[PDB]
Write a structure and sequence with these properties.
- By secondary structure, the chain is mainly alpha-helical.
- It has helices spanning about 5, 10-20, 25-35, 40-55, 75-90, 95-100, 100-115, 120-130.
- The protein contains eight helices and no strands.
- The longest helix has 15 residues, at about 40-55.
- It starts with a helix and ends with a helix.
- This is Matrix protein.
- It comes from Thogotovirus thogotoense.
């Protein structure tokens, strides 16, 4: 497949422009713009962020910033990452992500994209933004 096919509608144009133009400079502009968007929903931002991450191979600048308006304190990032990795070793990643609540899953995404030790491949990114 390709990212544009399964992402959400609000991210589609940003993602289509990045797929089609993996120039680091342009993808950065696209990330910052959606990062700083006016009133956007978090999941949209996170999908753009994930795709940027995959295409540029960089940690998206300010990606943790987008969680500041939100109480994540009920969440254990380390255990979220551990449960997610375990799910990849059992071919259950998709069922696992779907069974997370919206915030936990966005939070997982940000930690994973920021974790230089984890490199998502394409299928991983696709199951994530689906």
């Amino acid at each position: 497949r390709s990212f544009s096919e399964v992402c959400c509608a609000e991210a589609r144009a940003a993602i289509i422009q990045m797929e089609n133009n993996p120039d680091e400079t342009v993808c950065n502009r696209i990330w910052k713009i959606h990062r700083d968007l006016q009133s956007s929903d978090l999941t949209t931002t996170v999908q753009v962020m994930m795709v940027y991450r995959f295409i540029s191979k960089r940690v998206p600048e300010g990606c943790f910033a987008i969680l500041s308006g939100v109480n994540t304190g009920m969440y254990n990032p380390r255990e979220l990452k551990r449960s997610y990795v375990q799910s990849l070793s059992s071919g259950t990643s998709c069922e696992f992500l779907r069974s997370l609540d919206k915030l936990a899953k966005n939070l997982l995404a940000v930690h994973v994209c920021s974790d230089v030790k984890m490199s998502l491949n394409k299928r991983q990114v696709i199951d994530f933004i689906s």
